[PDB]
Amino acid sequence: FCGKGYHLMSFPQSAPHGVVFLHVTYVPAQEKNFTTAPAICHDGKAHFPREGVFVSNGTHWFVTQRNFYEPQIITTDNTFVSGNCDVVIGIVNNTVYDP
Amino acid sequence: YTMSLGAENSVAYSNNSIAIPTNFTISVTTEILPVSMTKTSVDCTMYICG
Amino acid sequence: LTGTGVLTESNKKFLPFQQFGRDIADTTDAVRDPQTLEILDITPCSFGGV
Amino acid sequence: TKCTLKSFTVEKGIYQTSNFRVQPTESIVRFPNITNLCPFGEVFNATRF
Amino acid sequence: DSTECSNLLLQYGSFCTQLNRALTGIAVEQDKNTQEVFAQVKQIYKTPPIKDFGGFNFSQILPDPSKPSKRSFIEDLLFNKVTLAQKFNGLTVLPPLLTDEMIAQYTSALLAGTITSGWTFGAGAALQIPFAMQMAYRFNGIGVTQNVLYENQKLIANQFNSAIGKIQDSLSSTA
Numbered sequence: 138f139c140g141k142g143y144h145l146m147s148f149p150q151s152a153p154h155g156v157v158f159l160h161v162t163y164v165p166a167q168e169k170n171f172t173t174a175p176a177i178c179h180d181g182k183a184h185f186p187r188e189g190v191f192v193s194n195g196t197h198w199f200v201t202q203r204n205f206y207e208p209q210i211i212t213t214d215n216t217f218v219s220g221n222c223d224v225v226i227g228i229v230n231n232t233v234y235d236p
Numbered sequence: 237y238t239m240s241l242g243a244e245n246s247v248a249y250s251n252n253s254i255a256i257p258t259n260f261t262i263s264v265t266t267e268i269l270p271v272s273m274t275k276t277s278v279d280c281t282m283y284i285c286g
Numbered sequence: 287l288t289g290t291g292v293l294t295e296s297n298k299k300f301l302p303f304q305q306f307g308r309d310i311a312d313t314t315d316a317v318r319d320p321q322t323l324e325i326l327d328i329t330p331c332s333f334g335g336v
Numbered sequence: 337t338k339c340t341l342k343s344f345t346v347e348k349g350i351y352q353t354s355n356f357r358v359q360p361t362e363s364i365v366r367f368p369n370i371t372n373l374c375p376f377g378e379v380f381n382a383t384r385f
Numbered sequence: 386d387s388t389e390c391s392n393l394l395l396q397y398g399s400f401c402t403q404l405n406r407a408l409t410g411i412a413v414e415q416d417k418n419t420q421e422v423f424a425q426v427k428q429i430y431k432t433p434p435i436k437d438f439g440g441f442n443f444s445q446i447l448p449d450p451s452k453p454s455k456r457s458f459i460e461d462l463l464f465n466k467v468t469l470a471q472k473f474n475g476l477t478v479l480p481p482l483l484t485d486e487m488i489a490q491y492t493s494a495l496l497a498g499t500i501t502s503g504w505t506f507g508a509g510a511a512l513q514i515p516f517a518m519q520m521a522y523r524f525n526g527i528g529v530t531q532n533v534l535y536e537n538q539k540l541i542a543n544q545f546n547s548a549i550g551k552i553q554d555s556l557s558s559t560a
């Protein structure tokens with residue numbers, strides 16, 4: 138709606154019988170595949186991400202943002218605890234570090 | 237020519253695959269929108285009588 | 287040419303076969319007086335922009 | 337303004353007004369210096385048509 | 386078909402020409418509305434799989450494969466259920482600039498991009514995402530935690546399938 142991509146700002150400038158908008162926008166530059174999982178089963182408990190999605194590089198797992206690859210180690214601050222491992226579909230086995 | 241629907245693209249849906257950006261681009265685009273049309277009016281004495 | 291209006295002296299040149307002058311949108315802007323051969327511009331009695 | 341709106345009460349704002357406020361009282365005629373009479377007598381009264 | 390056609394046209398043609406410019410402006414305005422609604426995104430996408438969207442059946446709203454028309458079954462019912470120069474003394478019907486095939490293709494591209502990529506596809510390069518994780522993000526946007534979704538994925542899938550089946554039966558029956 139406001140330019141093309143994720144919107145940062147728009148600067149208006151006048152024009153004779155018109156207005157021109159300079160839209161500063163955010164565009165994802167490069168792409169990369171990752172393996173993903175909905176939740177992590179640790180100590181018999183299901184862990185769901187508070188913010189971000191789970192990605193995997195090789196065998197090891199991180200949680201990261203949807204719009205930028207900033208891998209952070211999974212922590213009890215990063216994920217919240219709810220449910221059980223049985224009812225969730227697609228859960229993988231991993232560990233949850235705690236500070 | 238036939239009207240372009242746009243650039244052709246293909247993405248492979250998967251139940252266990254995600255695509256996360258590694259780099260980002262800050263872009264300035266231009267959108268031009270008309271605001272007003274030049275106001276006109278008619279003089280009735282000139283239009284009818286002259 | 288019978289009409290009520292204001293007369294104006296203008297620098298408009300007429301060919302000898304052309305007596306009456308019409309402006310754009312067929313109004314009579316200019317006319318050549320018979321007694322004095324000056325070309326006289328025709329302007330409205332009221333400008334009407336009040 | 338009252339005449340153009342066609343009402344005694346006029347509300348607040350701008351109103352374009354059209355009316356012959358002038359009403360000129362002067363008539364001028366300018367015809368060329370020709371004053372000799374036309375030969376209508378010859379055409380109408382010719383002995384032979 | 387009258388005689389002295391040139392004189393009548395010269396005497397009364399620009400009035401009709403102005404009215405025809407008005408009608409042409411109306412027509413190009415309607416084409417502008419069609420492009421305004423059906424052409425948000427120019428990127429065209431295709432959906433290979435049919436039944437891996439977290440148990441959600443999408444056979445009838447997505448365009449079916451192996452048919453010359455890009456039309457879906459629901460859009461088949463939509464075009465089926467609605468019934469439509471000398472004859473009109475010169476009034477003509479201009480065809481739409483966007484034909485129905487590319488309108489169906491635009492809807493197909495919107496559906497394919499939405500299902501494959503969430504909200505991302507219009508921003509730039511399409512980022513693939515599972516449909517269940519997209520539903521988790523939509524629930525998080527609403528305000529309910531995503532843990533409900535993975536606790537009742539089959540229930541929501543069955544409710545969605547039953548709802549679209551009810552819509553199919555409503556549109557198929559005469560009403």
Ligand SMILES: *[C@@H]1O[C@H](CO)[C@@H](O[C@@H]2O[C@H](CO)[C@@H](O)[C@H](O)[C@H]2NC(C)=O)[C@H](O)[C@H]1NC(C)=O
Pocket residue numbers: 194195196197
């Ligand atoms: C994925 O990337 C992470 C982060 O770089 C790798 O984890 C590191 O691996 C090296 C070698 O195994 C260790 O020395 C570091 O201590 C690890 N750091 C972290 C943050 O875990 C991980 O090995 C990579 N996985 C693969 C092989 O793709």
Ligand SMILES: *[C@@H]1O[C@H](CO)[C@@H](O[C@@H]2O[C@H](CO)[C@@H](O)[C@H](O)[C@H]2NC(C)=O)[C@H](O)[C@H]1NC(C)=O
Pocket residue numbers: 229230
């Ligand atoms: C994740 O770990 C759990 C246990 O921590 C695994 O559950 C075991 O699965 C084996 C294989 O059938 C059974 O013999 C055990 O009885 C299970 N143990 C428990 C406590 O349920 C589970 O299979 C692992 N998941 C994966 C994908 O490897």
Ligand SMILES: *[C@@H]1O[C@H](CO)[C@@H](O[C@@H]2O[C@H](CO)[C@@H](O)[C@H](O)[C@H]2NC(C)=O)[C@H](O)[C@H]1NC(C)=O
Pocket residue numbers: 166258259260
């Ligand atoms: C993301 O893309 C930008 C391009 O805008 C990269 O910046 C370039 O980095 C190289 C290597 O240092 C420089 O030679 C170029 O001059 C940079 N470009 C500009 C416009 O300054 C950036 O390195 C990329 N980031 C990653 C992680 O790949």
Ligand SMILES: *[C@@H]1O[C@H](CO)[C@@H](O[C@@H]2O[C@H](CO)[C@@H](O)[C@H](O)[C@H]2NC(C)=O)[C@H](O)[C@H]1NC(C)=O
Pocket residue numbers: 436442443444445550
């Ligand atoms: C999704 O729903 C459609 C219709 O609701 C299913 O299509 C049916 O398919 C079976 C064979 O699998 C046919 O016998 C039926 O006649 C079809 N129904 C109609 C209305 O044509 C489709 O199978 C469903 N998807 C899955 C994966 O089961």
Ligand SMILES: *[C@@H]1O[C@H](CO)[C@@H](O)[C@H](O)[C@H]1NC(C)=O
Pocket residue numbers: 168169170248
């Ligand atoms: C992700 O995988 C698909 C299929 O293997 C491939 O076509 C695509 O190029 C990959 N993505 C990137 C960024 O390489």
Ligand SMILES: *[C@@H]1O[C@H](CO)[C@@H](O)[C@H](O)[C@H]1NC(C)=O
Pocket residue numbers: 226227251252437
């Ligand atoms: C994901 O899709 C693949 C491809 O068919 C399939 O083999 C696998 O069973 C699917 N997994 C889940 C959890 O749906």
Ligand SMILES: *[C@@H]1O[C@H](CO)[C@@H](O)[C@H](O)[C@H]1NC(C)=O
Pocket residue numbers: 320321322368369
């Ligand atoms: C008519 O006569 C006047 C003076 O008697 C003279 O100034 C004028 O030029 C004459 N006009 C013509 C057309 O003869």
Ligand SMILES: *[C@@H]1O[C@H](CO)[C@@H](O)[C@H](O)[C@H]1NC(C)=O
Pocket residue numbers: 377381383
């Ligand atoms: C026209 O000529 C006749 C004689 O043929 C004459 O009697 C008559 O009076 C003339 N008319 C005029 C205008 O004098």
